[PDB]
């Protein structure tokens, strides 16, 4: 049976665009019904890496389960959660993606972070995350203290380092900065490692799934 996304794109649904919340739960589907120009997708502007592949890999799913890979209440004792954005508004108020967590400085420091997750389930886990690129050095420091930060994401079949690039992009949804989105499929028995000293849009909800 087809998966109805309504007014949302695959990106808006998978990342958790706040306006894509009433979407009804489904554990299985074949074919995703998406409008030609969905209104609700990447509310916070940025590049969604390997998107078309993701769209293809999610076209037919036999099992789908969302879980809190990194629970908000206990995973980030040393960091604060940003107030999100007006670009991602819900009910007249600023919000953010439901499946991601915008970590910010706690006090006068954005401490180094190392968070890992082992795929205890017997299914593949879709992990998504982002990397923020402020438009100005003032915003970089205001949020992360350090001017030069890094983000590292490593598994047994994935390893990438992300360096924020501070600059004004053309305005999109009133935002000159950007959040680049990334993803990987964590096979059973593998471990993913998140390391950063700033600019990480951390995973909050991941998806254990069986493709096809």
């Amino acid at each position, epitope marked *: 049976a087809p998966l109805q996304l309504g007014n949302c794109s695959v990106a808006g649904w998978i990342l958790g665009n706040p306006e894509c919340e009433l979407l009804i739960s489904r554990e299985s589907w074949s074919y995703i019904v998406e409008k*030609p*120009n969905p209104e609700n997708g*990447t509310c916070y*502007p*940025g*590049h*969604f890496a390997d998107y078309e592949e993701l769209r293809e890999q999610l076209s037919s799913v036999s099992s789908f389960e969302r879980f809190e890979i990194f629970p908000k209440e206990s995973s980030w004792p040393n960091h604060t959660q940003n107030g999100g954005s007006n670009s991602c508004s819900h009910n007249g108020e600023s919000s953010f993606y439901k499946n991601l967590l915008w970590l910010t400085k706690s006090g006068s420091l954005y401490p180094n972070l190392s968070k890992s997750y082992a795929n205890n389930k017997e299914k593949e886990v879709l992990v998504l995350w982002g990397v923020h690129h402020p438009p100005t050095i003032q915003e970089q420091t205001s949020l992360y203290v350090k001017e030069n930060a890094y983000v590292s994401v490593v598994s047994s079949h994935y390893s990438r380092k992300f360096t924020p*690039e501070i*600059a*004004k*992009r*053309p*305005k*999109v*949804r009133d935002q*000159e900065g*950007r959040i680049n989105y990334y993803w990987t499929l964590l096979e059973p028995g593998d471990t993913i490692i998140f390391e950063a000293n700033g600019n990480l849009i951390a995973p909050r909800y991941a998806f254990a799934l069986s493709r096809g």
Partner: antibody
Amino acid sequence: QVQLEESGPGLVKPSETLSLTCSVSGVSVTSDIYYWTWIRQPPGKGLEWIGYIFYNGDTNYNPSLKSRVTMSIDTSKNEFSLRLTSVTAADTAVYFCARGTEDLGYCSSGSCPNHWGQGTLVTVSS
Amino acid sequence: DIVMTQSPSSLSASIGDRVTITCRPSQNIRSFLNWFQHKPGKAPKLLIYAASNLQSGVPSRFSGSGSGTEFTLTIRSLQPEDFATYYCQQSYNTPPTFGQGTKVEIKR
């Protein structure tokens, strides 16, 4: 914030090589996020894209002019340049230099110049 | 190779009028379309980015709409300083290509 200024207007003899430079102020031309571009407008015609250059070595020129175009970056002077060989009257135009910010979710690579210079007129004559 | 066709090529309207300019590419470009404004002797200015995003400092009377093969630039309340030539530009395929331009004149 950023300012771009093309080199002075003037003449180029036919079959010779046009050389233009763009002086950049406010940002470094070595920056990885920014691309540097040239565009032209012949008299009474519209706009024609010539190409872009990244400090990282990434370049792309319009197939209409690829063989004749060479672009470069000068980090010492914070400038970039355009060279066009074998010029003809068809190359008589106002040349604009410009900057763009790489933004792959909303633009092809190096394809959205959003800060332009005012342009310099090049006349091909003997 | 992607041909950008603008309509009309020139128009004249009174102060306060609503002005619409159409741009049609030769193929579907999704939302990879930008609108430029070019005044005599001045640097061309990016007004609308990716079909609909207003740029910093541009008055809110300018707006962009459309996707695929039909795009529209709207000036809701034409002002004298809006005299210029307006270009659409596609960013979907290389080489980037511009429309032939639309000259907007002021009726007074």
